Design an enzyme around this catalytic site. Structure first.
Site, PDB file in Angstrom:
ATOM      1  N   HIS A  41       0.822  -1.241   0.000  1.00 45.06           N
ATOM      2  CA  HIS A  41       0.000   0.000   0.000  1.00 45.06           C
ATOM      3  C   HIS A  41       0.853   1.289   0.000  1.00 45.06           C
ATOM      4  O   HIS A  41       0.270   2.351  -0.223  1.00 45.06           O
ATOM      5  CB  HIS A  41      -1.024  -0.035   1.137  1.00 45.06           C
ATOM      6  CG  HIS A  41      -0.477   0.085   2.527  1.00 45.06           C
ATOM      7  ND1 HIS A  41      -0.380  -1.002   3.369  1.00 45.06           N
ATOM      8  CD2 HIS A  41      -0.110   1.159   3.262  1.00 45.06           C
ATOM      9  CE1 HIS A  41       0.082  -0.607   4.544  1.00 45.06           C
ATOM     10  NE2 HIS A  41       0.249   0.709   4.501  1.00 45.06           N
ATOM     11  N   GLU A  72       0.936  -8.415   0.814  1.00 46.93           N
ATOM     12  CA  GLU A  72       1.146  -7.025   1.314  1.00 46.93           C
ATOM     13  C   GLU A  72       2.624  -6.696   1.493  1.00 46.93           C
ATOM     14  O   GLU A  72       2.886  -5.634   2.101  1.00 46.93           O
ATOM     15  CB  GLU A  72       0.380  -6.799   2.626  1.00 46.93           C
ATOM     16  CG  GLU A  72       0.104  -5.328   2.960  1.00 46.93           C
ATOM     17  CD  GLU A  72      -0.542  -4.491   1.867  1.00 46.93           C
ATOM     18  OE1 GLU A  72      -1.262  -5.078   1.020  1.00 46.93           O
ATOM     19  OE2 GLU A  72      -0.306  -3.260   1.848  1.00 46.93           O
ATOM     20  N   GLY A 146       1.458   5.712  11.057  1.00 46.60           N
ATOM     21  CA  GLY A 146       2.889   6.057  11.189  1.00 46.60           C
ATOM     22  C   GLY A 146       3.768   4.862  11.545  1.00 46.60           C
ATOM     23  O   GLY A 146       5.007   5.015  11.468  1.00 46.60           O
ATOM     24  N   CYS A 148       3.463   1.807   9.921  1.00 46.06           N
ATOM     25  CA  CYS A 148       3.488   0.827   8.798  1.00 46.06           C
ATOM     26  C   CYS A 148       4.932   0.729   8.289  1.00 46.06           C
ATOM     27  O   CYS A 148       5.617   1.786   8.186  1.00 46.06           O
ATOM     28  CB  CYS A 148       2.449   1.124   7.716  1.00 46.06           C
ATOM     29  SG  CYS A 148       0.762   0.757   8.296  1.00 46.06           S
TER      30      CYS A 148
END
Length: 182
Positions: A41, A72, A146, A148
């Site tokens: 992402h 991911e 904040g 990730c």
């Protein structure tokens, strides 16, 4: 404070950079050579900022399992003049549960941040931001925006990268040795 934080600190001080894309600032784990990982992402493009330096992306691959399900994790090769310490021997070979994990973050906003998240479950399937996702690790800590790309470690193992939360739990994508065989 103890050997959990000692191992986490040793990883953060040599194997992380601050990655900036159009979707924000992320903790980025360097694994070996010029190869690093970031949550998918982050939407990595042709150009990324690495510790505020404009850096060409030589390759970027959004991993999926062999059921063609999102993992991911994006593997990035950076056009950087310097190699990362090779930490591939700290990566687990199999999916597993863990005790006594630390989630470590380093951004402009959250420098030198270490969170003892405790017990980590092999959760497996998660609907993450609307996307079916596999190989998810779950920990019972109220993680926030904040964090990730934050690195999840135990003493002696680098087991995942933080990719989301629901206010009560945090979720990481597994790192496996087989992602980084060359």
């Amino acid at each position: 404070m103890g050997p959990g934080f000692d191992f986490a600190q040793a990883i953060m001080k040599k194997n992380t950079v601050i990655a900036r894309t159009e979707k924000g600032e992320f903790t980025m784990l360097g694994v070996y050579d010029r190869v690093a990982v970031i949550p998918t992402h982050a939407s990595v493009g042709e150009i990324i900022y690495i510790n505020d330096v404009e850096t060409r992306v030589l390759d970027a691959c959004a991993l999926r399992d062999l059921t063609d399900t999102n993992l991911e994790i994006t593997i990035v090769k950076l056009d950087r003049n310097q190699k990362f310490r090779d930490i591939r021997h700290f990566l687990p070979r199999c999916e597993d549960d863990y005790n006594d994990a630390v989630l470590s973050v380093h951004t402009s906003k959250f420098p030198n941040m270490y969170i003892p998240v405790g017990q980590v479950t092999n959760y497996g399937f998660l609907n993450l931001g609307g996307t079916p996702t596999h190989r998810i690790l779950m920990y019972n800590f109220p993680t926030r925006a904040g964090q990730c790309g934050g690195v999840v470690t135990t003493t002696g193992k680098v087991i995942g990268i933080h990719v989301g939360g629901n206010g009560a739990q945090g979720f990481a994508a597994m790192l496996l040795h087989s992602y980084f065989t060359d």
